[PDB]
């Protein structure tokens, strides 16, 4: 069966990694098993497999753009002051360094500085830990990029985080997969607020919908995660991408649970 690792014992495996200058002791990269894909392990706690791992308490921040013309018309017609467009990319949930904004001034961009001219950030308490693990991931990706085949060492590297336009919030991205070969939503999504018995006498969620119940699908899925809702899951993080563009480390949602 598939092993997904747990987000403290990944977190806990690659700090010390990075302590220790050593990420290979965590994050390996199986170069030699158009568009290429090489498979990403991670040893957790004994335990090397493909690096899956669960998340808990992450609050998305962002809207997801709309994917139809139609939708798009619509929303442009309740807000004539701004214009909305069409969604081109797979829909994403954004996660923030931390869970609230560092305090801003008034231009809405520079992070305040107190009495000693210290730049303000929020307390540990809302350190997003999935952002603190994508960190390590993207610093294992890099580290490992350099030691790997020199046909790469060359290549561009995308990063997995946008810490520019300087953000005063760092954003991480995980890519809600819609099956381009069929146009339905690969990842289950469940509703938390909607709390079921089962008969195996586990309790789990329904799955998320509309309001005309219609399951998450492309088109009503700017509609079912919205800023600010919180998300538990399992991210995919089992392959990385070696393209034209350059050599990417996607993040994809396994499986959501969400909660608005």
């Known amino acids: 069966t598939t092993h997904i690792f747990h987000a403290d014992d990944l977190l806990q495996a690659l700090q010390?990694?990075?302590?220790?200058?050593?990420?290979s002791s965590v994050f390996?990269?199986?170069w030699d098993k158009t568009v290429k894909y090489v498979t990403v392990n991670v040893?957790?706690?004994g335990k090397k497999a493909?690096?899956?791992?669960?998340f808990q308490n992450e609050k998305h921040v962002g809207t997801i753009p709309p994917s139809t013309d139609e939708e798009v018309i619509r929303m442009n017609a309740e807000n004539p002051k701004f214009l909305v467009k069409k969604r081109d990319r797979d829909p994403c949930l954004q996660f923030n360094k931390y869970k609230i904004s560092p305090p801003l001034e008034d231009d809405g961009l520079t992070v305040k500085k107190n009495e000693?001219?210290?730049?303000?950030?929020?307390?540990?308490?809302?350190?997003?830990?999935?952002?603190?693990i994508i960190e390590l991931l993207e610093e294992a990706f890099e580290d490992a990029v350099q030691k790997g085949p020199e046909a790469m060492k060359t290549k561009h590297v995308i990063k997995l985080i946008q810490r520019k336009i300087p953000l005063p919030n760092p954003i991480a991205r995980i890519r809600i997969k819609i099956n381009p070969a069929t146009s339905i939503l690969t990842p289950i999504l469940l509703d938390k607020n909607k709390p079921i018995t089962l008969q195996n006498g586990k309790t789990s969620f329904e799955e998320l919908k509309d309001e005309d119940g219609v399951k998450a699908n492309p088109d009503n899925i700017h509609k079912l995660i919205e800023s600010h809702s919180i998300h538990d899951g399992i991210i995919n993080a089992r392959s990385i991408?070696?393209?034209?563009?350059?050599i990417s480390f996607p993040l994809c949602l396994e499986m959501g649970v969400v909660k608005v």
């Open 16 to 23: 010390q990694a990075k302590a220790e200058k050593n990420f």
């Open 28 to 30: 390996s990269l199986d």
């Open 43 to 45: 040893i957790v706690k």
């Open 50 to 54: 493909p690096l899956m791992f669960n």
């Open 116 to 132: 000693q001219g210290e730049e303000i950030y929020p307390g540990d308490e809302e350190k997003s830990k999935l952002f603190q």
């Open 241 to 246: 991408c070696i393209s034209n563009m350059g």
